[PDB]
């Protein structure tokens, strides 16, 4: 009943197995002779065991700047920071003499250290295709008062599949079991591909390209503060032998996005691929099928509404003393029924029936005389 | 006396032509004229007309959305009329399960407040508006003047490619005429001085204007109505379920990379100033004073500069001052004089290669110091 209202909807009918294609933002309605009508939707795609390959720094900050110099011929200066792996250091030469605190005139050694702190990062993950979990929701056409257009899941059986565990049998309370035999059909091969995750954005990129990025990194093993290649975001400037300066190279966030234009983007995990499934319905049964026909009169709870695919939805309530009973329905015969074998459970609870009316003027007849409803449609 | 200690130092001996640049000092000498030290202390672009200001890092705040049921028209927010907001109209799937009596494509509208976090401004600078600051320090052998980088001993002078020629007066030495010619690296015409925080570059005008970033015109400085906000903002609605507004991330480092093949600026500029110096109005201070009679003392051990020259600081004891210091080994601090017995004197001289004898004063109490170059 979930598909009712979804624009990207398919009506798959089985001859007298049934093959369906599920993907994100797409719903599927399945029908078969003397079998219940079912609604399928791919609710979530997830990469589960991800091995971090490398983590890169895209925005950094330099703090705790410290400098030490020596007078000419007094040797090389040193800071403890040169042994701290979170610090970036550089040795240079400055002009020393009487006017800047030295007895001799010459090139005095200098050393500048600063604390490299990462503000933003992006991690590249290796994902095994077989570790890609899919979440499918199966909702039967139960004509329930609340089931129409419901996106919660309080009416649908959730089921999980993986390219390995491709086939699953799923039980539906009152309809029996349904066998699901799903085949994986992703867009890009995860082998030699890296799932590059940047905050809320994500992409699938070539391994060599990823490793060849000129940015400070931490290995997959060290998930640490000892960023390798700090030099790629840090610059030391001493052009006139007067002073050494340490400068951060600025955020590579937008730079990365631009570099990632000709790459497979991922929405956020909403993946490009589709799941080609096969459906066995031999273990499925129409709920009721043994119930007798309704004798009483019906009331129109909600004005007949048309879906984006030309089909119509009728909300009706029972009044007679027959329930649980089969609702008599006809579109004179011209149009077909989507909510096959419509049944009443309680007089109080209304029923939603979806049917395909014929092109032009039609007559929707619900119930048996006396008190027969003869509604009019125009498709 | 400023040049003593500076590695990038030139000894120009004579009009006299000199070349001043940043981190470079120049020592000038002429027959019966005082020895002078020149340094280019500051280069400044003075009347800069902001051409355009670009946003390199932005933030989206105050996100608001309004939708309509199918056939109920187009939604609207007041924000669509606020110029600090970026908005977009789209279509979503509407129906019974999401609050509509009808099933169809209901119109949606998403607005968010575009706030700039970081910018870079491009400035048009007139070549003639480029002010230079030169410091002239005479070789006065003063106790504090040696290696001093303050300016409490040097006459500051300002020049511009227009006002290229200036006469500068030195208290006790007369006046010095300097006729400077501009020699910058890149022509400021069709060039834009792109300033990003503490970094700066000189770039092509067309390239600058053709940058795909949000911008405020030179006229609107301090405005909030950023043009082209779209360049840093993205609206995502792939499944007709929801519209999302996303910031495109800092272009700071991106810009630095794009600016590799550009003339970088540290305002410390690339160019040099080729000057001409007229010293006819300059005079040696003393020149009329008599020779010192007394004995001299060695205040500080003789030190060698990076250019082989030596510096001697000495104090007077006799009752002759103000008087000319007798000196013999060429001399850099020409006509060394005593002003007060209390105040020592710094004399810079070029010793010969190998063993030499630095003789300061007249007998009795003559100093006969030894050098090895």
């Amino acid at each position, epitope marked *: 009943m979930r598909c009712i209202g979804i624009s990207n909807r398919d009506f798959v009918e089985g001859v007298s197995w049934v093959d369906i294609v599920l993907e994100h933002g797409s719903c599927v309605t399945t029908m078969a002779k003397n079998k219940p009508t079912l609604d399928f939707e791919l609710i979530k795609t997830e990469a589960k065991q991800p091995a971090t390959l490398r983590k890169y720094c895209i925005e950094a900050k330099l703090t705790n*700047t410290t*400098t030490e*110099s020596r007078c000419p011929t007094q040797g090389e200066p040193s800071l403890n920071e040169e042994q701290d792996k979170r610090f970036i250091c550089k040795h240079s030469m400055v002009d020393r003499g009487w006017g800047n*605190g030295c007895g001799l005139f010459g090139k005095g050694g200098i050393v500048t250290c600063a604390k490299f702190t990462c503000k933003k990062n992006m991690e590249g993950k290796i994902v095994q295709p077989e570790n890609l979990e899919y979440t499918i929701v199966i909702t039967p056409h139960s004509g329930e008062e609340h089931a129409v257009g419901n996106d919660t899941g309080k009416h649908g059986k959730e089921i999980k599949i993986t390219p390995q565990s491709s086939t699953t049998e799923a039980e539906l309370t009152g309809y029996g079991t349904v066998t699901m035999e799903c085949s994986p059909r992703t867009g890009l091969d995860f082998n030699e591909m890296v799932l590059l995750q940047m905050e809320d954005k994500a992409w699938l990129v070539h391994r060599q390209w990823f490793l060849d990025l000129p940015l400070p990194w931490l290995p997959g093993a060290d998930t640490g503060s000892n960023w390798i290649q700090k030099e790629t975001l840090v610059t030391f400037k001493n052009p006139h032998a*007067k*002073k050494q*300066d340490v400068v951060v190279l600025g955020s590579q966030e937008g730079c990365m996005h631009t570099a990632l234009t000709g790459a497979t983007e991922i929405q956020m995990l909403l993946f490009t691929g589709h799941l080609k499934c096969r459906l066995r319905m031999d273990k499925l049964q129409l709920k009721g099928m043994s119930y007798s026909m309704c004798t009483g009169k019906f009331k129109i709870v909600k004005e007949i509404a048309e879906t984006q695919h030309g089909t119509i939805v009728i909300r009706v309530q029972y009044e007679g003393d027959g329930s649980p009973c089969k609702i008599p329905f006809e579109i004179t015969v011209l149009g077909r029924l989507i909510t096959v074998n419509p049944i009443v459970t309680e007089k109080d609870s209304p029923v939603n029936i979806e049917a395909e009316p014929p092109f032009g003027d039609s007559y929707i007849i619900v119930g048996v005389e006396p008190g027969q409803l003869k509604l009019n449609w125009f498709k | 006396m400023r040049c003593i200690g500076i590695s990038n130092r030139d000894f120009v001996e004579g009009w006299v032509d000199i070349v001043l640049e940043h981190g470079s000092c120049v020592t000038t000498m002429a027959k019966n004229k005082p020895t002078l030290d020149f340094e280019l202390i500051k280069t400044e672009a003075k009347q800069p007309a902001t051409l355009r200001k670009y946003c390199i890092e932005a933030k989206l705040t105050n996100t608001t959305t309004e939708s309509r049921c199918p056939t109920q028209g187009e939604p609207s927010l007041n924000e669509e009329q606020d110029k600090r907001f970026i908005c977009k109209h789209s279509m979503v799937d509407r129906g019974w399960g999401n609050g509509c009596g009808l099933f169809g494509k209901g119109g949606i509208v998403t607005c968010a407040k575009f706030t700039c976090k970081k910018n870079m401004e491009g400035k048009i600078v007139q070549p003639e508006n480029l002010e230079y600051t030169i410091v002239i320090t005479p070789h006065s052998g003063e106790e*504090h003047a040696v*290696g001093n980088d*303050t300016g409490k001993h040097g006459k500051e002078i300002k020049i511009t490619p227009q006002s290229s020629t200036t006469e500068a007066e030195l208290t006790g030495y007369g006046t010095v005429t300097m006729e400077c010619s501009p020699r910058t690296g890149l022509d400021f015409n069709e060039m834009v001085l792109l300033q990003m925080e503490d970094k700066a570059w000189l770039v092509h005008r067309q390239w600058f204007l053709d940058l795909p970033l949000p911008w405020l015109p030179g006229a609107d400085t301090q405005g909030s109505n950023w043009i082209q906000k779209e360049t840093l903002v993205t609206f995502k609605n792939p499944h007709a379920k929801k519209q999302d507004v996303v910031v495109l991330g800092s272009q700071e480092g991106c810009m630095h990379t794009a600016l590799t093949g550009a003339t970088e600026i540290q305002l410390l500029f690339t160019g040099h100033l080729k000057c001409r110096l007229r010293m006819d109005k300059l005079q040696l201070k003393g020149m009329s004073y008599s020779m010192c009679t007394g004995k001299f003392k060695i205040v500080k051990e003789i030190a060698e500069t990076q250019h082989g020259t030596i510096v001697i600081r000495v104090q007077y004891e006799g009752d002759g001052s103000p008087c000319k210091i007798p000196f013999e080994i060429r001399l850099i601090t020409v006509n060394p004089i005593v002003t007060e017995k209390d105040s020592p004197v710094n004399i810079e001289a070029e010793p010969p290669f190998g063993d030499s004898y630095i003789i300061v004063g007249v007998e009795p109490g003559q100093l006969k110091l030894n050098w090895f170059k």
Partner: antibody
Amino acid sequence: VQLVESGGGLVRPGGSLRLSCAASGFSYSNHWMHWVRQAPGKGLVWVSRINSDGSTRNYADFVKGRFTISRDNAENTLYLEMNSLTADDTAVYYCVRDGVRFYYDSTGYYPDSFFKYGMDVWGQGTTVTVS
Amino acid sequence: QSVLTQPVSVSGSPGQSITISCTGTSSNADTYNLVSWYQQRPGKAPKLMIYEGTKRPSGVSNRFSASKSATAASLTISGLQPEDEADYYCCSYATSRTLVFGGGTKLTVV
């Protein structure tokens, strides 16, 4: 030659304050500047120092990273930005010049180890009460 | 680390001579070579009396002198006057880049 401090007053525990100091009568840009404090009825306690360039900023051990020293050379101003203040920080804060370093390094840049120094010019001090 | 210790108090009579010591723990010869002394009169700002262990700035009375060794630094006040009643502080480097004051000595002129 004078140093005049400003920005002192009553602050709540955990609060922030920015002290300022106006310098006059000397070549400010070429001198190291220090902050010294004195709790009521207690001794002088060294807080921080800054070189000409601001490239060297040193702090006493009790300033874990709560205080930031800064300067504006053209404005002849010294600052002390203070956050997460406690009763331990209640004191008179003095703005101080290192006049003797100027006679050895007239640039005021070089952060040589154990440099000859002398705190020769002091302001009257500004009172900070964390209460 | 370097920690500077001074006597808490010293009493003297007018015309007499008094010596205030400044002794360090994790200190060395350079600690004392760099000692500076400050006089703080009641209700007044501190005043530099000595720098570089033994140097007296111009304007400071010749009654103030100082001495240094490899183990201590001392300030001597000759011909004690009532105006000498003050707190005296020694100062030196705690580390290569930080300074520290001694606890101070309260001098009472009886």
